[PDB]
Write a protein that holds these residues in place. Sequence first.
Motif, PDB file in Angstrom:
ATOM      1  N   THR A  36       0.829  -1.198   0.000  1.00  0.00           N
ATOM      2  CA  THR A  36       0.000   0.000   0.000  1.00  0.00           C
ATOM      3  C   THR A  36       0.866   1.251   0.000  1.00  0.00           C
ATOM      4  O   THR A  36       0.702   2.136  -0.851  1.00  0.00           O
ATOM      5  N   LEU A  37       1.817   1.330   0.935  1.00  0.00           N
ATOM      6  CA  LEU A  37       2.625   2.537   1.069  1.00  0.00           C
ATOM      7  C   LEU A  37       3.517   2.760  -0.152  1.00  0.00           C
ATOM      8  O   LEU A  37       3.636   3.893  -0.630  1.00  0.00           O
ATOM      9  N   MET A  38       4.147   1.704  -0.683  1.00  0.00           N
ATOM     10  CA  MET A  38       5.066   1.918  -1.801  1.00  0.00           C
ATOM     11  C   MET A  38       4.303   2.281  -3.066  1.00  0.00           C
ATOM     12  O   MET A  38       4.763   3.114  -3.857  1.00  0.00           O
ATOM     13  N   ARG A  39       3.144   1.657  -3.290  1.00  0.00           N
ATOM     14  CA  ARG A  39       2.330   2.032  -4.439  1.00  0.00           C
ATOM     15  C   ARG A  39       1.826   3.461  -4.300  1.00  0.00           C
ATOM     16  O   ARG A  39       1.817   4.218  -5.279  1.00  0.00           O
ATOM     17  N   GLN A  40       1.421   3.858  -3.090  1.00  0.00           N
ATOM     18  CA  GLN A  40       1.018   5.243  -2.876  1.00  0.00           C
ATOM     19  C   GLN A  40       2.174   6.194  -3.155  1.00  0.00           C
ATOM     20  O   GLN A  40       1.973   7.273  -3.715  1.00  0.00           O
ATOM     21  N   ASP A  41       3.391   5.812  -2.763  1.00  0.00           N
ATOM     22  CA  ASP A  41       4.540   6.692  -2.966  1.00  0.00           C
ATOM     23  C   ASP A  41       4.922   6.792  -4.441  1.00  0.00           C
ATOM     24  O   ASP A  41       5.277   7.874  -4.918  1.00  0.00           O
ATOM     25  N   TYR A  42       4.858   5.684  -5.182  1.00  0.00           N
ATOM     26  CA  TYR A  42       5.093   5.764  -6.623  1.00  0.00           C
ATOM     27  C   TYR A  42       4.012   6.572  -7.328  1.00  0.00           C
ATOM     28  O   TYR A  42       4.307   7.312  -8.271  1.00  0.00           O
ATOM     29  N   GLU A  43       2.755   6.451  -6.899  1.00  0.00           N
ATOM     30  CA  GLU A  43       1.721   7.283  -7.501  1.00  0.00           C
ATOM     31  C   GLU A  43       1.898   8.749  -7.120  1.00  0.00           C
ATOM     32  O   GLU A  43       1.624   9.637  -7.934  1.00  0.00           O
ATOM     33  N   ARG A  44       2.364   9.022  -5.901  1.00  0.00           N
ATOM     34  CA  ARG A  44       2.692  10.391  -5.520  1.00  0.00           C
ATOM     35  C   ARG A  44       3.831  10.929  -6.373  1.00  0.00           C
ATOM     36  O   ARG A  44       3.822  12.098  -6.759  1.00  0.00           O
ATOM     37  N   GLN A  45       4.833  10.094  -6.656  1.00  0.00           N
ATOM     38  CA  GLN A  45       5.907  10.489  -7.562  1.00  0.00           C
ATOM     39  C   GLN A  45       5.387  10.761  -8.966  1.00  0.00           C
ATOM     40  O   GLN A  45       5.816  11.725  -9.611  1.00  0.00           O
ATOM     41  N   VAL A  46       4.483   9.915  -9.460  1.00  0.00           N
ATOM     42  CA  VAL A  46       3.888  10.141 -10.773  1.00  0.00           C
ATOM     43  C   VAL A  46       3.160  11.478 -10.789  1.00  0.00           C
ATOM     44  O   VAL A  46       3.274  12.258 -11.738  1.00  0.00           O
ATOM     45  N   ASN A  47       2.403  11.760  -9.725  1.00  0.00           N
ATOM     46  CA  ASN A  47       1.704  13.038  -9.615  1.00  0.00           C
ATOM     47  C   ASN A  47       2.676  14.208  -9.518  1.00  0.00           C
ATOM     48  O   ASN A  47       2.423  15.267 -10.099  1.00  0.00           O
ATOM     49  N   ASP A  48       3.772  14.049  -8.774  1.00  0.00           N
ATOM     50  CA  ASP A  48       4.760  15.115  -8.657  1.00  0.00           C
ATOM     51  C   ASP A  48       5.373  15.425 -10.013  1.00  0.00           C
ATOM     52  O   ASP A  48       5.518  16.591 -10.397  1.00  0.00           O
ATOM     53  N   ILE A  49       5.737  14.381 -10.754  1.00  0.00           N
ATOM     54  CA  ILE A  49       6.261  14.557 -12.102  1.00  0.00           C
ATOM     55  C   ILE A  49       5.222  15.233 -12.985  1.00  0.00           C
ATOM     56  O   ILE A  49       5.527  16.173 -13.731  1.00  0.00           O
ATOM     57  N   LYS A  50       3.972  14.775 -12.893  1.00  0.00           N
ATOM     58  CA  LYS A  50       2.899  15.346 -13.695  1.00  0.00           C
ATOM     59  C   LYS A  50       2.736  16.831 -13.413  1.00  0.00           C
ATOM     60  O   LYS A  50       2.578  17.630 -14.336  1.00  0.00           O
ATOM     61  N   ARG A  51       2.786  17.225 -12.140  1.00  0.00           N
ATOM     62  CA  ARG A  51       2.556  18.626 -11.800  1.00  0.00           C
ATOM     63  C   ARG A  51       3.762  19.494 -12.140  1.00  0.00           C
ATOM     64  O   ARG A  51       3.596  20.641 -12.562  1.00  0.00           O
ATOM     65  N   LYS A  52       4.982  18.989 -11.945  1.00  0.00           N
ATOM     66  CA  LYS A  52       6.152  19.743 -12.386  1.00  0.00           C
ATOM     67  C   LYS A  52       6.092  19.995 -13.881  1.00  0.00           C
ATOM     68  O   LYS A  52       6.364  21.110 -14.351  1.00  0.00           O
ATOM     69  N   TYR A  53       5.721  18.972 -14.647  1.00  0.00           N
ATOM     70  CA  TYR A  53       5.573  19.158 -16.080  1.00  0.00           C
ATOM     71  C   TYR A  53       4.413  20.099 -16.389  1.00  0.00           C
ATOM     72  O   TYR A  53       4.510  20.920 -17.308  1.00  0.00           O
ATOM     73  N   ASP A  54       3.326  20.011 -15.616  1.00  0.00           N
ATOM     74  CA  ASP A  54       2.210  20.936 -15.771  1.00  0.00           C
ATOM     75  C   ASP A  54       2.680  22.371 -15.619  1.00  0.00           C
ATOM     76  O   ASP A  54       2.365  23.231 -16.445  1.00  0.00           O
ATOM     77  N   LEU A  55       3.437  22.639 -14.563  1.00  0.00           N
ATOM     78  CA  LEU A  55       3.912  23.980 -14.284  1.00  0.00           C
ATOM     79  C   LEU A  55       4.882  24.478 -15.338  1.00  0.00           C
ATOM     80  O   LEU A  55       4.768  25.629 -15.762  1.00  0.00           O
ATOM     81  N   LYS A  56       5.826  23.645 -15.778  1.00  0.00           N
ATOM     82  CA  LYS A  56       6.745  24.070 -16.831  1.00  0.00           C
ATOM     83  C   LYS A  56       5.994  24.397 -18.118  1.00  0.00           C
ATOM     84  O   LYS A  56       6.210  25.454 -18.731  1.00  0.00           O
ATOM     85  N   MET A  57       5.116  23.487 -18.551  1.00  0.00           N
ATOM     86  CA  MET A  57       4.324  23.710 -19.755  1.00  0.00           C
ATOM     87  C   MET A  57       3.510  24.992 -19.640  1.00  0.00           C
ATOM     88  O   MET A  57       3.515  25.831 -20.550  1.00  0.00           O
ATOM     89  N   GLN A  58       2.819  25.166 -18.512  1.00  0.00           N
ATOM     90  CA  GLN A  58       1.995  26.350 -18.316  1.00  0.00           C
ATOM     91  C   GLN A  58       2.838  27.611 -18.341  1.00  0.00           C
ATOM     92  O   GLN A  58       2.465  28.597 -18.984  1.00  0.00           O
ATOM     93  N   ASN A  59       3.990  27.591 -17.671  1.00  0.00           N
ATOM     94  CA  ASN A  59       4.837  28.770 -17.615  1.00  0.00           C
ATOM     95  C   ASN A  59       5.256  29.179 -19.021  1.00  0.00           C
ATOM     96  O   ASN A  59       5.007  30.316 -19.460  1.00  0.00           O
ATOM     97  N   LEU A  60       5.843  28.230 -19.757  1.00  0.00           N
ATOM     98  CA  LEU A  60       6.405  28.546 -21.062  1.00  0.00           C
ATOM     99  C   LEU A  60       5.307  29.008 -22.010  1.00  0.00           C
ATOM    100  O   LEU A  60       5.444  30.034 -22.695  1.00  0.00           O
ATOM    101  N   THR A  61       4.186  28.277 -22.030  1.00  0.00           N
ATOM    102  CA  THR A  61       3.049  28.684 -22.846  1.00  0.00           C
ATOM    103  C   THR A  61       2.562  30.072 -22.456  1.00  0.00           C
ATOM    104  O   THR A  61       2.129  30.843 -23.315  1.00  0.00           O
ATOM    105  N   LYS A  62       2.637  30.420 -21.170  1.00  0.00           N
ATOM    106  CA  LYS A  62       2.193  31.739 -20.741  1.00  0.00           C
ATOM    107  C   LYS A  62       3.059  32.855 -21.302  1.00  0.00           C
ATOM    108  O   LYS A  62       2.524  33.783 -21.922  1.00  0.00           O
ATOM    109  N   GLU A  63       4.382  32.799 -21.110  1.00  0.00           N
ATOM    110  CA  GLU A  63       5.143  33.925 -21.655  1.00  0.00           C
ATOM    111  C   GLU A  63       5.085  33.921 -23.175  1.00  0.00           C
ATOM    112  O   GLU A  63       5.157  34.992 -23.792  1.00  0.00           O
ATOM    113  N   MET A  64       4.944  32.746 -23.795  1.00  0.00           N
ATOM    114  CA  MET A  64       4.716  32.708 -25.233  1.00  0.00           C
ATOM    115  C   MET A  64       3.401  33.388 -25.593  1.00  0.00           C
ATOM    116  O   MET A  64       3.288  34.016 -26.651  1.00  0.00           O
ATOM    117  N   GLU A  65       2.397  33.280 -24.722  1.00  0.00           N
ATOM    118  CA  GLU A  65       1.119  33.941 -24.969  1.00  0.00           C
ATOM    119  C   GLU A  65       1.249  35.454 -24.849  1.00  0.00           C
ATOM    120  O   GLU A  65       0.646  36.197 -25.630  1.00  0.00           O
TER     121      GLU A  65
END
Lengths: 49, 49, 118, 51, 52
Positions: E23-52
Motif C-alpha cells: 500500500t505505502l510503496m504504491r502510494q509513494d510511486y503514484e505520488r511520484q507520478v503526480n509530482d512529475i505530472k505537476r512539475k511538467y504541468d507547471l513548466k508547460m503552463q509557464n512557457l506557454t504563458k510567456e509565449m502567450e
Amino acid sequence: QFYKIRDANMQELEDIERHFEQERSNLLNEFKAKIQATFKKHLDLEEQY
Amino acid sequence: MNPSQTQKGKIQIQVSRGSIDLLVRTMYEDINNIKLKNERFQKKKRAED
Amino acid sequence: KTLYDKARDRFKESSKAQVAMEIKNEVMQKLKERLLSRAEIIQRRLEEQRQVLEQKEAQVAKRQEIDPKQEEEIRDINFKIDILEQRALRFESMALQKYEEMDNRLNKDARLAALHRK
Amino acid sequence: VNILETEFDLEREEMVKTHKTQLKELEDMIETVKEEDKKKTEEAQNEFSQF
Amino acid sequence: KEQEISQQDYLFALKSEHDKQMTLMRQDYERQVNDIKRKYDLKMQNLTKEME
C-alpha cells in the motif's frame, strides 16, 4: 463378554478421537479459507482507484 | 459455525448410550431364565407333595 | 495521530421566548403548508377526475350507439370522483383536527414552556 | 468420554476466542483506503469546479 | 496447538505487513507520478504563458 465389551469400548474411543481430530481439521480448514479471502481483492481496489 | 462440528458432546453421548443399550441386550439375552425353571419346579412340587 | 490511533480514538468515542415565537411560526407554517398543499393536491385530483369523466361522456356522445364498455368506464370514473370527494371531505376534517392536534402537541412541550407565561 | 469431550470443549473455546479476536481486530484498514479515495476525489473536484 | 496458533499469527502479521508495504510503496510511486505530472504541468503552463 466382559472383555469383548472392553475391546469395543477401546475401538469406540479410538473412533471418537479420530472424529475429534477430523472436526478440528475441518474447523481449521474453514477458518483458513475464510481468512484467505482477505487478499488481492483489496489490492485491485487500489488498482481501480 | 458448522452445526455438526460444534456439537460433539451430544452426538458422542448418544453413541455411548446406544452402545450401553446394545451391550445390555446382548448380556441379557442369555441369563436369568434358569431361575424361572427352578422356581416353577419348586412350586409344582409344592402343589404336588 | 496515526490512522490506526485515529481508529482507536474513534472506537473510544463510540464507547461513551423571543426566538420561540419564530420557531413556532416555522413549525406551524410547515404543518399548514403540508395540510393545505395536500388539499390543493386533492382539488387537482378532483378536477382531473371531472375532466376525464367529461372526456369520456363527450366520447360517448360522439358514438351514435352507446358502448356498454364505455358505460362501465364512465361508472368507474363516477365512483372514483365520488370516493375522492369523500376522502377530500375527510381530509378537510382530519386536517383541521391535525392542525389543532399539532398546536396542542407543540404549545405544551418544554421547548415552548415560556409561552404559558404569555 | 466425558474427559475426551471436555478437553476438546476447551480447545474449541480457545480457537473460538482466537478467531473472534483476529476477526475483530484486523478489520480497520479498508475504511482508511475508501476514505482516502473519496477525499482525494473531492479535493480534485473542488478546484476543477473552481476552474 | 499454541505453536500452531503462534505460527498462524506470525504468518498473518507477515502478510499484513506486506499489505502495508505494498500500500505505502504504491502510494509513494503514484505520488511520484503526480509530482512529475505537476512539475511538467507547471513548466508547460509557464512557457506557454510567456509565449502567450
